[model samples]
Target chain A: LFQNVSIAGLAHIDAPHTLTSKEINERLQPTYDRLGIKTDVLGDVAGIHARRLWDQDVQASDAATQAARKALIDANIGIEKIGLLINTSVSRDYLEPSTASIVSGNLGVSDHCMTFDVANASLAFINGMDIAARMLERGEIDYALVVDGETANLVYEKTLERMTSPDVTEEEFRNELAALTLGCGAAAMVMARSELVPDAPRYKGGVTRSATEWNKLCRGNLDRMVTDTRLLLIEGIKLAQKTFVAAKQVLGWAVEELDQFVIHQVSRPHTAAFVKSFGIDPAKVMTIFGEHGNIGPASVPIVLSKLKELGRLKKGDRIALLGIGSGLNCSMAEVVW
Target chain B: HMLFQNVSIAGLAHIDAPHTLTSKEINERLQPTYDRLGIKTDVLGDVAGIHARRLWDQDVQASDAATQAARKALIDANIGIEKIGLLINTSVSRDYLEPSTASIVSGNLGVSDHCMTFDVANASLAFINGMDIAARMLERGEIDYALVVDGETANLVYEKTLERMTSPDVTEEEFRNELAALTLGCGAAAMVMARSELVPDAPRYKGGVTRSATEWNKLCRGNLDRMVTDTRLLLIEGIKLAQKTFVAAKQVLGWAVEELDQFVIHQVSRPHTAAFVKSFGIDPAKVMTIFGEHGNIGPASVPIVLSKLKELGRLKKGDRIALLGIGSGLNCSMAEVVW
Candidate 1:
């Protein structure tokens, strides 16, 4: 259990452009007709109506900066208060100097502010929170920012181009379909000392369970990914089940007791299967996948931010933040709002 | 400065790449462009002081290299893989962006389910960052032991960068910017950190300070194919930041230049190292240089040098060592390691 650190504020931004699944299917209809295929795996099977996308020129750093500004505003604080800033996004602008430095430069964080990038697929934001929480718990720093920004515009464009080619194979098209589910979005959270924000939500860190033998199930580059979705669904759920058992012992989480579940968005079927497997109430889970699709690492926080904006959260509500990432790793954390 | 009282470096190991690409071989390819630009090839060896750099086989992955180093490190600690409660991979070269290079390395090592793993990407400063992170967990009693691993592979860049720099149309400015990439080499380094009580005879890590000049981040930017660097700006700005970082370290860790037994600094170039020593007035003999043979190994440089020192029996009890580096974020970090 974490002692002195809690979430002071949270905010998220959805990308501007919306690309519907129907339009995507229309674009792939040529390939479908050529292959004698008729199933709408994207819309009817995956249940992704539409996903948001940023303009072609928006860098990951740019999206994160916008989210960070909103998060600071939500926390009612100045950038001077941030002692550590971590960017945990799957999308990055460069391989060298961290994206955190670029975002912090945009936000004008002080020199005393330490910044870096943590990458662990979708579970990284939680990892960043735990890292910041340790500092806040030890009183090493007063405030820290954990930010994530994801963009799939380039991947979507490139994947669609490949799938529409005359030489495309059925196997190739299926492998490229997962890239279509990815969306563009950004989320940021400000964590502070509990004494500084007495009324803020308390963060209690939780457990992680990994089945890395399944690590090869999903592999992604900047604009390309090859996934065995069938294997991922089976292996991801298995890992999550084991993680939840650990959560019950460490976080004292019970499916019935939790008021909200902000799980990482992969697809509609994946979410439904997970909820049903755990006997979790569908009403407790708030999803943006239907409209926002899968936002990679930003999915959980974006849903939580939406819940906060919609006034769906109440004081003392137990919220579970869960995700099964590509590492076949599942992390489950709790927040008492 | 955040000091750790109970964190100890229980074990360390480094692996040098079996292949070396010498500056002469690179110069042979670039001779035509150098003549076109009216430049001398000796600048690479004489000016940068890098004669050769190592490279792994094309088929070797960063995770595979790091796993090899981790196994050796565990052996050095005389511990089994089950003792590791946390693992962090800090390397410029990564296997993938999603699953995390750490996960792959952990999987290769067959770590237990209780272990937590992730990747920390901060250019050259990341190894120190990884150590500090693991130290925090160790000192807080959150984990009894942790592994910090780093593996850098520069084969792909050398293949692509050389092709681009040797082009007939390459400009003088472009050649100058790409020169830094030639100095990068390949290697893997891993360290096992634990609570002091568990490793009473090991080196104690007292964390130091970090100072950032992020405004200079634009001075050095790299990608898969190429890296653009404003050499003069990076040198001038990097030195300014390091001076400030050393001042803070002096106050916090009592880092007196002459008092320290050894200095394990990041290897970038001969001029950069010479400039740093002259500015600080430190003994040239105390600072070791592997850049001539190994080149700049990015984040693994500091740990690799320290591991070599340990392997060669250069360290003694109560010897104070300083770890420092100026990374791409124009970020400077200085930490103390006591043997």
Candidate 2:
């Protein structure tokens, strides 16, 4: 009467030692001077203490490959058994052959591996999980891997320059906050059919809602996100509320029954507001945002991986993973970890 | 093999493209040819349901619009970023063949590592295929949240049509077929999909039936930037195949054409929409049109319209919507959307 898929394993990589918001503002000194601005903006306004960035140039594919190897190890599966590999990253290496294919190559995935990318900004991790679950449940694939490696340094460097431009307006000047929320990261998940891992925690799929009317609230070009911070946060939260009601119904979830809630981290307040609104215990929701910033879409999976690392997740613990962002989209799913 | 107690779309969202290009602009561009061909009639305004279409100016790519749409969809869902497990980009025009545009979107969105993303290409029906792909994933209990996005651009085709413009032997029929491409504007759309049980507040996406006539793959041909097709045979034969497929769908999906609240179809052209509705005896009022303004956006059209309808305050809860698509390779699919 019911279908069950298991998230056999997961892994993540966050950027190295953090840089405080004060330091970020210091780095923006030239831009602030050039724009004729006078405010201790980054640290005072956002209350962000610090964030992470990789020590070296870690390409999306490289990060994904590393995570995939660890995921396989965690799952106790070989690359040969991977029937599908999906790269769900906000950062990519190129335009052709799919980053998933490149990761497949790097990971030495077998000939049976069908690879592709699911690029939907931050929500893609959830998107990829559903896809893997479907294929596995249908017996179309035995083991499926979903991966994401997000990098936003390019955006940071670019936005800083634009904000420093002489012609930059007040509206244009406010867009730099998105850069503060971004953090570099990588994540991966290995999923299999219930029969393959009958004793594993069963995946209870989730739900979503969308509001494209606020689509322009958060937009980034090649280098920087030209965002409306206030609008994005307000709209994003409203969208999340709607999606939560849907999730509660579809996943048959009672907030009280959940052991943990893993969410996409936009900022400290965003995470705090989300937990409070859902009435979920703050302790149940992990925090990597202070050190990791947002990490684009990779924050959630990275947190999940960290949860595993801390040995916090117990067998049959009901977990709710959720996130909302630009595209005005909100999605939430349930899994037994 | 998988069955669900109920499958529905819990929530939906769509954004309007910034710029709109009318058939009038297109006609003005084709003025010299129209005069040379001894044609003095208005082609777009009166005949086609589309009077104007939206397009992205400057350097907007399909992925750019799609990523924006994806963001809006996520915001609408009101969930945290960590929850999503799948993302599928299904637009026809893409920035690269190798990396899959979906990867680019994911990178921009900063998805979780547990998340997976991919791109599926087929033509107009690709979005429908994406919906099905996400649906199966949801049904199978893989992950709870999935996002599907698409953005289509036709700026390149308009910039370089001098060859076809100067062809002396070009017949009106041929010109009509060619002009369908001209109607193609640019836009992006995104949808958040999930298991019905997860979001009981959202409408259900009751899965439908699909059929393909890949034998007619040559009916339409496409490269990276532009697409062209043999319209007559593609439409006639494609519809015939659709009829057969519809019969099969009737058996499998229990689709009652008249019982549906609305039919959200891929807008290839006015005539195609008209012909399909007439042939199937579908109620015209039930069918919504965005083609006159948005043109043919390949796979992004249907989802874009759905998003726009929500923005325009047209869609309502408890509404029954039908998703219909006909694309290159002569693929036709029908799915149900419960709002």
Candidate 3:
């Protein structure tokens, strides 16, 4: 749908500390023994061996600022050129001022820069990109930045502590298990008019389908998240199936036609089921959930950045960025390199 | 075939909280704290010019309030929920962090599966940001109608801050820092915007410009129950930012202070609004503010004022209205609406 929008630059940051499933299991031994649970769900079933975390003092703004810096550098532009800066992170610094404003302050964006945070759970990054692309296509802003920094460190620390309590019931323990799968990371993309970034990747704004009746299926705050992971998988895939149909009509999406599928990192089963349901080539998809866990909204962009870093993406390649977020929402967009 | 055209505000409505919490009642509870701190001024009444503010029942969430306004908005627009292809919630108060508040409102309204929803957060300026975001889609002929809803619930903050400030352990500095939290009020506003062709008689929205002084992002920070603000600093830096925004507005919107029929501005306090009006040399009679009785309704303030103006039949055909606000991010935006 876009004639001029292109990805001038994109970058991601892997958090510093590594919190492995083995270490987490060691701490949960007491609760596991009492509940009579033997199978290691996080490691064996989920296939998330380890996830990254930042230090206690690191805020979402700090992480997003770093990624924005790297993205600006990647674009070879100064902060003055950014007309819009949208922070799409689920991890937020405060309810007011917005995490985007904090990141803008940190990056020293120009006065003309419009900043705000868009929250739609894991699907927000694509939402942010589409929002920016509209302005780019209209010649409203010269360039824009979509940034996300997810800090699962707080949720992990709090969930681990709460679940480890002796009085923690089996229901509470089971419902809270998904929190351990989260990881900390950041990703930022600098989008500009295609003419400005001559050979950069072209972004074709995609389609979205929502089943908000299942909005309560996955609810999260700063330190806790309770999910019906089972229903999430069923409903999420259903939504993705519906979205892909829309994609076919809108973006001409097809399984074999796409060069790569950048999907949201939720879990092993979720990813495999999505890949299988869509009949997408497994080799065409790049994943980081094995080591980094689900980095919330940062996952899809992080994978795309990783693909570029690995030089797997080539000229004229068709890339699909896909996500199924907590609103039980699914969005699928494309990038032509 | 894209029916690209200028966006127009098809409908607008606002929900006022039922219960009233007077500033005098607040002062009564803070008597001890005030005496201890050697303060005799009626801060909310005299300083902020906030005589009373409204509060919702303990059970009404932001989504509930937002839905009420959105339903009315749809009726005002003479449209059905199915016509809405985009919905954005611009409230500081939210139901949860995972599923966007927009989704909650969208589900309540029974929007189509094709509707896109999300929440934009930047304190008071989000409603304008929401309108601009929605305008893009409407302008592209991508969506027929978009709803921008904002519902701010400051009930919890009033209850919690008063309880904490009245305790024996409360410090003067802490009490003063939290006084601004008491100025917040509960309200909801919703606007349904569509392509100019869809609502030919509706007011045309000439989207304006935005300027930021994010370096002062820390001037006012709020969470669920507390808001710590440096009012003096916010007033100064906020005006500085608003001035910059107006400069951009003049260039983009051709906004002339004297030419505007009405100024729909986000209310903070009496002096803040007064200072902004005075600084811009805007005609004082053209500005309509609800801060005195309604208090600062956060992001809902601007739309609520505009909706009230419509309800009062104060707007004339082809009249020019300027919508402006300085949010907690120290963010300022100025846009125009031709009625």
Candidate 4:
């Protein structure tokens, strides 16, 4: 059932910045002092300046719609032609109606369009792509749009408060400070049936493995945020390693097979660890986390969009998109552009 | 196009969650004055036709319930977990943002590593959607046995709503609307399906079609924590969309009203189910009622009800089952399940 699925176009939105750790700490000094947060590490400690934030009350659906529109225009397809829409954002508009439905309505997609949300944290974009590809291959739908809009503003807002709280501890402080590194952004990609867009590069479907035992490493409650930061990072990376080994076995991919690596924008250290472990050159790895913090699930597409704008993606360029998310779900898919 | 001449439902299993929350109990617990308004109607009983709804205790997760149902379905089919090709979680409620509910179900069932897994969410109709997705794969010769599961938990919303309703000045309409709180139930359902060529005795799913009237999208909204909805509009416009979707099904699937042996739909409320059947001129007897007992299990309702039909020996060879549903996106779908 695996067939031609391609990344037609990619775009990303991020908050601009190169804030150093010392600088970020200076800004947080007041809250840090007030709340008694005394963590030595700051996200800006590693040279991140400013990350983008939408105006207050801006929604995940809004950002997703904006990116979807841009992707549609890029792909030269009308909204009516889109037969499927999958929203892969961690942020959502509602549980019942679905953020995908809202995006479809905003895009004015035809009634024939099948819409839904596929959220599994950071890996959702790949999940969404695989799903669209299957539907397209089955001849169930022709054109499909995989869109994600993620915002860390709420996380930042609450994290800052939690960090500034008088009772904050060292462990709590480290985790909360990492949350500060996350930036808000959204991204989308337009994909079509291989036959319909023959010129579009074909999508060779990939494989995945789940370590659900690590499911509790990262969890976010709307009211209270809690996570085992170190364990998540360590276990998540190991899970990715196992997944990449499996990918190498099935997809027959080695590090040299990719022209570029688009890894999910989580954090400087996480990305660094991933690239180093795989012996991948830093030049080939696109790092937006320093500037945008971690865009959560939107990281992959946001980086792809930047690559497209830079004209770095060439015909037949092998690009590997890798992701590790909260459910400890690790997925990697390769796209020929 | 590849023809799916052999894919059929081999076995089915469903477990209705415990803890029934009645409309009368909900009304009594209202924090605000329950009888101040001049309201003469009961929301669940008179309008939606829901009386009591079952809810899973806090101990169960969507994946857990689905795992239980999947086990039963596999046992019923006399198939081992290793024989399954794909496991799809089609529930509206999920456990996490990363590890898909489908993955968890896969892990729980001890399926082979080569087996594919994922979650498909489309409000109340996702199980049918999952069936279509898996059947297509089966038809394309992807794998043999496939399992689709759904488990919903609306208790999170009830827990939050109870805190708000305890106020002393709540109105009748507000109380009436809370009946939706009563109409939602927690349950898990699983369907074991295989290629008809592989399992000649199973019922074949003749494919399904759908229509979306998204203009009414805002009538309902839900998050992981809550599902605050405009219940009145849902009942009125919901039937309208279902009626249109049924017309499309009749045309595309060549469905005859009298030929359908059963009409298994999403369990919303008693009246909503009745209204949809009446609108399409379907026999009430052909439509099974689970709403009064199960409330709304979201996407699990159809598959779970079908599972019940099998257990009771209500279905026979060549029996025709209609899977129908209306979700919050104002989406409606109807498909023929042939036994």
lDDT of each: 0.90, 0.72, 0.90, 0.76
In order of TM-score, best first, we have: 1, 3, 4, 2
The clash tally of candidate 3 reads 1
**Chain B alone: TM-score in each candidate?**
0.98, 0.91, 0.98, 0.93
For every model in order, the TM-score on chain A comes to 0.99, 0.92, 0.98, 0.91
True contacts kept of each: 0.63, 0.06, 0.81, 0.42
Q: What is the lDDT of residue A104 in candidate 4?
A: 80
For candidate 2, the lDDT comes to 0.72
B269-290 in candidate 3: lDDT tens per residue?
9999999999989888888878
Best by TM-score: 1
lDDT (tens digit, per residue) of candidate 2 on A1-337: 1276888888887666566777777766776787677986555555456777665677777888888898899999998888778887767644333566567767766534556566556777786787677667666678899988776667766766776666777666776666766777788999988888877777777776666445455665446666778877777877787788877776778888988988888776676677788788888888876666777567788988898888867888888888655565667888776
Cα lDDT of model 4 by residue, A1-337, tens digit: 2676665655666543333556556756876676665654544343455576777777788889988998888898788888888888877656677788888878887767778777676787887888788777777777889998876667766776776676767677765555565667888998877767777766787777666655556665432346676787788888888889998988888998789988877666777788899899999988876556677778887888888889757889998878767766778777777
The local lDDT score (0 to 100) that residue A222 gets in candidate 1 is 79
Candidate 4 displacement at residue A151 in angstroms: 1.9
Per-model TM-score versus the true fold? 0.99, 0.59, 0.98, 0.92
Docking class of 1: medium
Rank candidates by DockQ, best first: 1, 3, 4, 2
Report how large a share of the reference interface contacts model 4 reproduces. Answer: 0.42
Instruction: Rank the models by lDDT, top first.
Output: 3, 1, 4, 2
Residue by residue across B177-266, what tens digits does model 2's lDDT show?
A: 566566677778788887777777887777676554544545565544345667668779767866876786677667788777888888
